[PDB]
């Protein structure tokens, strides 16, 4: 819509007048406001009273944009207005997944701090620990352990985060997870123990 | 940080350091084998390696020499090999080897034994030319059980890049090298869109993405999105 | 060629095999006073001794005879040839010859065509067992890999020769490794004795495993001469797969 060229023009003399005056996938102003990542635009649009939990045809919430784009203050504003911490999209994924994929600490810490579900699984019965483990995100796993997150999340195929961590061949992360009490006996559908996956 | 270093020092270092192998006296291995019935491939890695270097390349269809001729075979493979070692350093991609690597008892079908004599003939010529040949020969297949033990014998194919369970780094690499030429956005994410084709095994995933480009080329939407991805996955 | 200068370590076994193979070569007059005939052949079961073919090509190279294999591993599969009589005609024309299969050393198609080759050599053993065109026609089996079960099962040692060959002489680990070090560029301050004697248990293929698996580190460091530390790393590089 007119948000791309509005916020892209940068003419401050007509932005607040434009918003205070009144796409193909039904994305409102808040979605592009989270895509750009500006403080006064998400706090001004959310200051007027635009709905914070608008869902498109697929279900992509704006919190998946603020979490999938790497913006801390935008998550501070969406959580400031009380956005759905466990919204559902087309694939069932949560903003914690994309928060752990982008390697953003403040987004995950401030999402889980407000009372989000640490074990919120998607349509594939997976959590953010699969992404944080397979992507080598050590500090993301650590800040997930600041809230006593579960470790026995079984994927839709039967894989655990310890399997995705041992597949990356991260010796430090494997010894850390096993040292913290990771179940080394859960077998997936392929009948592969966590010790056999690690070469 | 070991796969790109082993393949790197196994592809780009032997390509322009033949005299050093003449000094040390160790033949550089160049045979890279791809396997796995679930993942077809033969396009992402073949075009990736075939496009990392801006030079000449000569690809061959799996039935490029099957003309039931006994004397034309060695002339064709000798001419292709001499223009590949003399014209410019190219990476020959031999496909569909299971149809030319089958034995037969009856001598009436001399064309099958003849084409397996062509494949084994170039398999012997590459052994006799191990001393720093100016050509790279990669190979791919999908049914290694029907193949002969001479192909998978060491000294010919010393690299076997399989595709059982690629980690997220290989997804960022093999998907970044393909999304760098397409229209990307903040919603374009093919991690679940590649995990599902692992549950339901589908071939030529890259060709399905090209079909998604054929559905997004209608000038109705500039940036390709999840609608053409999931639509191209449920339709074809 | 692979003469005696490229193979060593089986002095007792060549001393015992000169009467099986070398008997019709230089002393055939013992047929009256002894009464010997043409046996089936001989085979060596166990681990690969890194030269399982260099011995057949060595005795065949000293006998001054041709080497015609059956499977045709190197452009000798269709050069001679129902593809079953041409080998017997070339065996009739070339009386001195040594047969040794190297390529044979899915379970549905591979055992189908491979079963056609097994039936080929079985009917060839039936023709050679019934009649005979000329002498000096002997076949040698190869049992070194895991998928070799027909040759080891059909030859228990009742009407054929058998040699226990797990520990050949320890020279299959030592001195043929020295020979494999003579071909490639070797330095003068190397001690193959300890690095060749400190590789027990795994297999007999330590020679080819340490050479071929050491060529990746001699290819990595690009050293003009192979050092002992390269072989020392190759010992681990071949013991990791155990």
* Structure determination method: cryo-EM
Q: What is the largest CA-CA distance in chain B?
A: 61
Q: Is B123 exposed, middle or buried (0-12, 13-18, 19+ CB in 10 A)?
A: buried
**For residue C107, what are the β-bridge partners?**
none
In sequence order, the 6+-apart residues with CB closer than 8 A to the CB of B27 are B21, B130, B131, B132, C215
What does the alpha-carbon distance between residue B115 and residue B73 come to, in Å, rounded to a whole number? Answer: 8
What does the alpha-carbon distance between residue A108 and residue A110 come to, in Å, rounded to a whole number? Answer: 5
H or E element at residue B116:
helix B110-128
Q: Give the residue carrying structure tokens 């071939």.
A: B203
* Nearest by Cα to C141 from C126, C112, C161: C161
Contact C175, B118 (CB under 8 A): no
Contact (CB<8Å) A90/B226: yes
Breaks (C-N over 2.5 A) in chain C follow: 81, 105
Breaks (C-N over 2.5 A) in chain B follow: none
Question: What six digits make up the tokens of B214?
Answer: 């054929």
Question: What six digits make up the tokens of A22?
Answer: 């009144």
How many other C-beta atoms lie within 10 A of the C-beta of residue C1? Answer: 8
Distance from CA of A51 to the nearest CA of B (A): 21
- Asked if B127 is an interface residue toward chain C (Cβ–Cβ < 8 A), one would say yes
What does the alpha-carbon distance between residue C163 and residue C161 come to, in Å, rounded to a whole number? Answer: 7
Contact (CB<8Å) A168/B169: yes
Q: Give the residue carrying structure tokens 């590789």.
A: C199
- Asked if B173 is an interface residue toward chain A (Cβ–Cβ < 8 A), one would say no
- Asked if B145 is an interface residue toward chain A (Cβ–Cβ < 8 A), one would say no
- Per-residue exposure over B45-68, b if at least 16 CB sit within 10 Å of its own CB, e if not: bbbebbeeeeeebeeeeeeebbee
End-to-end CA distance of chain C: 34
* Nearest by Cα to B41 from B177, B215, B230, B207: B207
In sequence order, the 6+-apart residues with CB closer than 8 A to the CB of C115 are none
In sequence order, the 6+-apart residues with CB closer than 8 A to the CB of B155 are B127, B130, C212
CB-nearest to B24 from C78, C108, C222 is C222
What does the alpha-carbon distance between residue A86 and residue A83 come to, in Å, rounded to a whole number? Answer: 9
How many other C-beta atoms lie within 10 A of the C-beta of residue B73? Answer: 19
Residue of B18, B101, B149 to mutate when probing chain C, most C C-beta within 10 A: B149
Q: DSSP 3-state assignment of A48?
A: helix
In sequence order, the 6+-apart residues with CB closer than 8 A to the CB of C82 are B106, B107
Distance from CA of B105 to the nearest CA of C (A): 6
Planar angle of CA C133, C138, C144, nearest 5 degrees: 155
**For residue B160, what are the β-bridge partners?**
B33
Q: Give the residue carrying structure tokens 């190279």.
A: C61
Q: How far is CA C212 from CA A97, B20, C143, C215, in A?
A: 46, 18, 22, 5
**Alpha helices (H) along A25-155:** 29-36, 39-48, 62-69, 72-81, 95-101, 105-113, 128-134, 138-145
- Asked if B186 is an interface residue toward chain A (Cβ–Cβ < 8 A), one would say yes
* Nearest by Cα to A168 from C129, B6, B171: B171
Contact A131, B168 (CB under 8 A): yes
How many other C-beta atoms lie within 10 A of the C-beta of residue C15? Answer: 9
Sheet holding C41-42, edge to edge: C41-42, C137-140, C97-100, C66-67
What does the alpha-carbon distance between residue C31 and residue C53 come to, in Å, rounded to a whole number? Answer: 30
Q: Give the residue carrying structure tokens 């999105």.
A: B225
Question: What six digits make up the tokens of B36?
Answer: 């796995």
* Nearest by Cα to C99 from C67, C75, C73, C71: C67
Q: How far is CA B99 from CA B43, B66, B81, in A?
A: 20, 10, 21
How many other C-beta atoms lie within 10 A of the C-beta of residue B229? Answer: 20
Question: What six digits make up the tokens of B186?
Answer: 């903040």
Question: What six digits make up the tokens of C185?
Answer: 């560029």
Helices (H) and strands (E) in chain B — how many of each? 9, 4
Helices (H) and strands (E) in chain A — how many of each? 13, 0
Planar angle of CA C92, C93, C95, nearest 5 degrees: 65
Cβ-Cβ pairs closer than 8 A, A with B, add up to 28
* Nearest by Cα to B229 from B200, B197, B201: B197
Q: Give the residue carrying structure tokens 């980690």.
A: B167
What does the alpha-carbon distance between residue A11 and residue A7 come to, in Å, rounded to a whole number? Answer: 8
- Give the pairing of strands C163-164 and C44-45: parallel
What does the alpha-carbon distance between residue C149 and residue B150 come to, in Å, rounded to a whole number? Answer: 19
Residue of B6, B171, B192, B231 to mutate when probing chain A, most A C-beta within 10 A: B192
Q: How far is CA C50 from CA C168, C186, C202, in A?
A: 11, 19, 14
What does the alpha-carbon distance between residue B11 and residue B6 come to, in Å, rounded to a whole number? Answer: 9
Q: Is C70 exposed, middle or buried (0-12, 13-18, 19+ CB in 10 A)?
A: buried
* Nearest by Cα to C47 from C167, C210, C175, C136: C167
Q: Give the residue carrying structure tokens 């067992």.
A: C129
Planar angle of CA B140, B145, B150, nearest 5 degrees: 70
* Nearest by Cα to A153 from A177, A179, A126, A131: A126
Crossing angle (nearest 10°) for helices A72-81 and A62-69:
150
What does the alpha-carbon distance between residue B93 and residue B46 come to, in Å, rounded to a whole number? Answer: 7
Q: DSSP 3-state assignment of A68?
A: helix
Q: CA torsion, points B144, B150, B155, B158, in degrees to nearest 10?
A: 0
- Rg (C-alpha) for chain C, rounded Å, is 20
Q: Give the residue carrying structure tokens 């006799």.
A: B128
Question: What six digits make up the tokens of B165?
Answer: 């369970």
Q: Is B99 exposed, middle or buried (0-12, 13-18, 19+ CB in 10 A)?
A: middle
Which H, E and C letters describe C26-38, residue by residue?
A: HCCHHHCCCCCCC
Distance from CA of A168 to the nearest CA of B (A): 7
> Would you give the distance in Å from CA C80 to the centre of its chain?
22
Q: How far is CA A154 from CA A180, A181, B98, in A?
A: 18, 16, 39
Q: DSSP 3-state assignment of A81?
A: helix
* Nearest by Cα to B115 from B123, C93, C189: B123
Question: What six digits make up the tokens of C61?
Answer: 């190279």
Contact B109, C82 (CB under 8 A): no
Q: How far is CA B54 from CA B51, B57, C177, in A?
A: 7, 9, 43
Which chains touch C (3+ CB pairs under 8 A)?
A: B
Cβ-Cβ pairs closer than 8 A, B with C, add up to 61
Contact B28, B132 (CB under 8 A): yes
In sequence order, the 6+-apart residues with CB closer than 8 A to the CB of C129 are none
H or E element at residue A165:
helix A161-167
Contact B35, B162 (CB under 8 A): yes
> Would you give the distance in Å from CA A78 to the centre of its chain?
13
What does the alpha-carbon distance between residue A66 and residue A83 come to, in Å, rounded to a whole number? Answer: 11
Q: DSSP 3-state assignment of A9?
A: helix
**For residue C138, what are the β-bridge partners?**
C98
C63 known member of a binding site: no
What does the alpha-carbon distance between residue B235 and residue B170 come to, in Å, rounded to a whole number? Answer: 26
**For residue B91, what are the β-bridge partners?**
B136
What does the alpha-carbon distance between residue B205 and residue A160 come to, in Å, rounded to a whole number? Answer: 26
Contact A28, A54 (CB under 8 A): yes
Residues of A in contact with B225 (CB under 8 A): 25
What does the alpha-carbon distance between residue B81 and residue B137 come to, in Å, rounded to a whole number? Answer: 10
Q: CA torsion, points C206, C207, C209, C212, in degrees to nearest 10?
A: 170
Question: What six digits make up the tokens of C20?
Answer: 């099986």
- Per-residue exposure over B194-206, b if at least 16 CB sit within 10 Å of its own CB, e if not: ebbbeeeebebbb
CB-nearest to A69 from B186, B226, B227 is B186
CB-nearest to B121 from C75, C82, C83 is C75
Residues of A in contact with B187 (CB under 8 A): 60
Q: How many residues does chain A have?
A: 199
Q: Within 13 Å of residue C204, how many CA atoms lie on the same side as its CB?
A: 21
* Nearest by Cα to C213 from C175, C172, C242: C242
- Asked if B150 is an interface residue toward chain C (Cβ–Cβ < 8 A), one would say yes
Which H, E and C letters describe chain C, residue by residue?
A: CCCHHHCCCCHHHHHHHCCCCCHHHHCCHHHCCCCCCCCCEECEECCCCCCCCHHHHHHHHHCCCEECCCCCCCCCCCCCCCCCCHHHHHHHHCCCEEEECCCCCCCCCHHHHHHHHHHHHHHHHHHHHHCCCCCCEEEECCECCCCCCHHHHHCCCCCCCCEECCCCCCCCCCHHHHHHHHHCCECCCCCHHHHHHCCCCCCCCHHHHHHHHHHHHHHHCCCCCECHHHHHHHHHHHHCCC
- Give the pairing of strands C97-100 and C137-140: parallel
What does the alpha-carbon distance between residue C135 and residue A113 come to, in Å, rounded to a whole number? Answer: 91
What does the alpha-carbon distance between residue C184 and residue C170 come to, in Å, rounded to a whole number? Answer: 22
Contact C152, C46 (CB under 8 A): no
What does the alpha-carbon distance between residue A35 and residue B150 come to, in Å, rounded to a whole number? Answer: 56
Q: How far is CA B229 from CA B38, B187, B211, in A?
A: 20, 12, 9
What does the alpha-carbon distance between residue B111 and residue C125 come to, in Å, rounded to a whole number? Answer: 28
What does the alpha-carbon distance between residue C207 and residue B229 come to, in Å, rounded to a whole number? Answer: 53
H or E element at residue B128:
helix B110-128
Identify the closest residue of chain B to C183 by CA–CA distance: B25
Enter the DSSP assignment of B33.
E
Contact B195, A124 (CB under 8 A): yes
Crossing angle (nearest 10°) for helices A39-48 and A29-36:
160
Q: CA torsion, points C133, C136, C142, C148, in degrees to nearest 10?
A: 20
What does the alpha-carbon distance between residue B100 and residue C20 come to, in Å, rounded to a whole number? Answer: 41
């Amino acid at each position: 819509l007119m948000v791309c060229n509005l916020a892209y023009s940068g003419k401050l003399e007509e932005l607040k007048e434009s918003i205070l005056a009144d796409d193909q996938d039904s994305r409102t102003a808040l979605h592009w406001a989270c895509s750009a990542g500006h403080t006064e635009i998400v706090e001004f649009l959310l200051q007027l009273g635009v709905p914070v939990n608008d869902k498109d045809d697929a279900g992509w919430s704006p919190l998946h944009i603020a979490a999938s784009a790497g913006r801390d203050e935008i998550v501070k504003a969406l959580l400031g207005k009380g956005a759905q911490v466990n919204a559902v999209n087309q694939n069932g994924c949560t903003p914690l997944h994309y928060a752990a994929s982008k390697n953003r600490h403040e987004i995950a810490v401030m999402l889980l701090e407000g009372g989000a579900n640490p074990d919120a699984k998607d349509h594939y019965e997976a959590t953010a620990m699969h992404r944080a483990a397979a992507k080598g995100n050590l500090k993301m796993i650590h800040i997930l352990l600041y809230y006593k997150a579960s470790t026995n999340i079984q994927d839709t195929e039967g894989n655990t985060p310890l399997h995705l961590a041992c597949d990356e061949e991260r010796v430090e992360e494997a010894k850390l997870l096993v040292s913290q009490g990771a179940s080394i006996y859960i077998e997936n559908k392929e009948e592969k123990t966590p010790l056999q996956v690690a070469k | 940080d070991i796969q790109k270093q082993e393949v790197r020092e196994a592809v780009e270092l032997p390509l322009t350091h033949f005299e050093l192998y003449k000094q040390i006296g160790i033949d550089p291995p160049r045979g890279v084998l791809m396997y796995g019935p679930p993942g077809c491939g033969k396009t992402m890695l073949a075009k990736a390696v075939a496009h990392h270097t801006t030079a000449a390349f000569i690809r061959v269809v799996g039935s490029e020499f099957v003309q039931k001729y006994l004397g034309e075979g060695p002339r064709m493979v000798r001419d292709v090999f001499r223009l590949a070692k003399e014209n410019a350093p190219a990476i020959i991609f031999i496909d569909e080897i299971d149809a030319i690597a089958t034995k037969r008892f009856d001598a009436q079908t001399g064309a099958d034994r003849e084409v397996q004599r062509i494949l084994l003939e170039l398999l012997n010529q590459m052994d006799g030319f191990d001393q720093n040949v100016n050509v790279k020969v990669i190979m791919a297949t999908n049914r290694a059980d029907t193949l002969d033990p001479a192909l998978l014998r060491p000294g010919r194919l010393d690299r076997k890049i399989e595709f059982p369970l690629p980690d997220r780094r290989q997804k960022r690499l093999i998907f970044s090298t393909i999304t760098s030429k397409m229209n990307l956005s903040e919603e374009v994410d093919l991690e679940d869109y590649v995990a599902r084709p692992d549950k339901i095994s589908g071939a030529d995933i890259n060709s399905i993405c090209q079909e998604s480009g054929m559905l997004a080329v209608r000038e109705n939407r500039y940036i390709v999105l999840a609608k053409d991805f999931e639509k191209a996955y449920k339709t074809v | 060629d692979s003469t005696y200068e490229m193979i060593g370590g089986l002095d007792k076994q060549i001393k015992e095999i000169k009467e099986v193979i070398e008997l019709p070569v230089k002393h055939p007059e013992l047929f009256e006073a002894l009464g010997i005939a043409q046996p089936k052949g001989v085979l060596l079961y166990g681990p690969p001794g890194t030269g399982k073919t260099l011995l057949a090509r060595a005795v065949a190279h000293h006998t001054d005879c041709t080497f015609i294999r059956v499977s045709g591993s190197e452009l000798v599969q269709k050069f001679i040839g129902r593809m079953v009589r041409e080998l017997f005609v070339m065996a009739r024309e070339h009386a001195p010859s040594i047969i040794f299969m190297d390529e044979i050393d899915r379970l549905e198609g591979g055992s189908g065509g491979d079963s056609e080759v097994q039936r080929t050599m079985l009917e060839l053993l039936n023709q050679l067992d019934g009649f005979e065109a000329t002498k000096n026609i002997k076949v040698i089996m190869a049992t070194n890999r895991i998928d070799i079960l027909d040759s080891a099962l059909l030859r228990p040692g009742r009407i054929d020769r058998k040699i226990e060959f797990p520990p050949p002489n320890e020279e299959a680990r030592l001195d043929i490794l020295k020979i494999h070090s003579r071909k490639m560029n070797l330095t003068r301050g190397i001690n193959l004795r300890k690095i060749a004697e400190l590789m027990p248990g795994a297999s007999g293929a330590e020679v080819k495993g340490v050479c071929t698996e050491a060529g990746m580190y001699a290819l990595r460091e690009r050293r003009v001469h192979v050092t002992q530390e390269d072989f020392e790393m190759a010992v681990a590089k071949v013991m990791q797969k155990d």
